Amino acid sequence: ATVNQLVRKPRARKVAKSNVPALEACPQKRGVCTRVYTTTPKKPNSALRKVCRVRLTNGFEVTSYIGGEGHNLQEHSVILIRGGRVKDLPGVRYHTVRGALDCSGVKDRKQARSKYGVKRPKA
Amino acid sequence: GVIVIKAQEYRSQELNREAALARLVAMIKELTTEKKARRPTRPTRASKERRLASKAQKSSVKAMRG
RNA sequence: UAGCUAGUAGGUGGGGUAACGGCUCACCUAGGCGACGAUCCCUAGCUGGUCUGAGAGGAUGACCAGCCACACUGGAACUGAGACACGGUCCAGACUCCUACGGGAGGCAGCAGUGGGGAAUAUUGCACAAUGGGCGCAAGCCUGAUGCAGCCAUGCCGCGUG
RNA sequence: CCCGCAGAAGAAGCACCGGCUAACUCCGUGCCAGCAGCCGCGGUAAUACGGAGGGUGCAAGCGUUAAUCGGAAUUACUGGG
RNA sequence: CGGCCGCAAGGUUAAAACUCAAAUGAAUUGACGGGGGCCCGCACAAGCGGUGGAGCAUGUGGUUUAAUUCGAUGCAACGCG
RNA sequence: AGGAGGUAAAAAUGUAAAAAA
């Protein structure tokens, strides 16, 4: 509407926001994975998810989500981080790829073996 | 750790002795017994209150495709 | 980000370059730029195009081609048709190597490769047969341009596992 | 490129099966442990969790994350209030 | 936050980080109102006689025990099964 | 039938004793 208002002030395109603020266009990043803990989600559900803070290689203390059940981390043992949210933890933006550089894929896991670092029993 | 306490205001030296004796007892006891730990606590009304939402919500979320 | 600029705006004359020009001095005029967005700050090589989209637009500029710019950092020239120069020279600095301590040497953002950073990205391969260039009367000589292979499912396309 | 031998030998996975969206049952755990792109699932019968078997999709690829556009006529000049 | 205006109180201009999957409008049906109107019931008013006071009977809670069987536990459990 | 004044009062929350770690 009002072309003259448009020729003075152009149609400003709203800035599209990203949801993985690690770094622009960085798929995965390595993380030291310091101080691991376990707390509880919000109102609708209730559990004790294994979650940790992650000191990144660019000095970013991001908060991630330790997946699965059988972990192998504590204060050290550098791993890998992938994006994604779980909505239950009020304030998480990062996931963790099990079967990482310093975290093994959990055993006694037969189905859903693409992720969670599950090796297919060749025998 | 070579503690040095100065007992000054009192013309009598022996009055300053007990003034230093008072400064001895309070200094060490305040550093002796610390805080009481072992917090936190487990939720109480979650067993009910949280489930209260689940009893009224599920009756509404049954869409039945449109 | 509201004013910006003082060889700065123009004039005259001399100097100057292959070439007109404050490109440079002497003197005169007091101007010129500015909301149609100047100075100032952040970001960025640009384009034919690429991806998507009904179209218009939106994002982008790896690969191929055109153009600009850079060569450890800054500056400055010289030879010459042309650079003010990747693999030439002079100076200063930073960082390494050689040393008889006097004094010198060097530049992979060329092809491979090493460390390193990183989520990640390949052999210290073979040969100038073809094509292109350079030089030469020609024959020829050199070329990690180029031509192929090694490695990778990275994508596309295709057959197979009857 | 062509020719001969050729024992089927030497060659099939991964995701998903609550709705969104093609695809189902049982056992184990009992809001604990976990799954999840969106709403959400689970209080001892869970088609949504873990596993088993059956099903579907795509295929030497398969899913996740990331980035762009589309859907977004939710920056609308075409094309909004 | 910075600029500007302001004696000051402040005003004007005008973000982002982070965060939820909503917030919101109008109308509809109920429900509710220490909102209004109409109407009914021992609701009250008008009285009669009790409970709660004492004893006893009987049921429950609690407590206790080797057990004090289970269940019922506002009105609508408690001389109940 | 219009009308005109007129006549009205205090009282909260829903783990609500049931926990500690």
Q: Which of A83, A31, A25, A90 is CA-nearest to residue A55? A: A31
Domains and CATH numbers, chain A: 1-123 (2.40.50.140)
Which helix (H) or strand (E) element contains residue A95?
strand A94-96
Q: For residues A56, A15, A27 and A40, what is the CA-based torsion angle, rounded to 10 degrees?
A: 60
Q: What is d(CA A117, CA B41) in angstroms, rounded to the nearest whole number?
A: 36
Helix (H, G, I), strand (E, B) or coil at B36: coil
Token look-up 């975290």 returns: A103
- Using CA atoms, how far apart are residues A41 and A88, in angstroms rounded to an integer? 5
The pair of structure tokens assigned to A65 is 């989500």
Give the tokens for residue A97. Answer: 């790829």
For tokens 């294994």, the residue is A50
Top residue of A38, A42, A43 to mutate, by most chain B CBs within 10 Å, is A43
In this structure, is the dihedral angle defined by the CA atoms of residues A97, A99, A104 and A108, taken in order, positive or negative? positive
Give the Cα separation of A84 and A67 in Å (integer).
Answer: 12
How was this structure obtained? cryo-EM
Distance of alpha carbon A41 from alpha carbon B61, whole angstroms: 21
**Residue B14 in tokens:** 């022996």
Beta bridge partners of A94: A83
Amino acid in the structure at residue B49:
E
- Is the CB of residue B50 less than 8 Å away from at least one CB of chain A? yes
Min distance B50 CA to chain A CA atoms (Å): 7
Cα–Cα distances in Å, from A69 out to A73, A116, B52? 12, 10, 29
Which runs of consecutive H residues, i.e. helices, occur in A2-117? 3-8
Alpha-carbon distance of A97 to A118, in angstroms, equals 11
Q: What is the resolution of this structure in A?
A: 3.5
Instruction: Give me the residues paired with residue A30 across strands.
Output: A80
Q: How many angstroms separate the CA of residue B3 from the nearest CA in chain A?
A: 38
Using DSSP's 3-state secondary structure scheme, residue A2 falls into coil
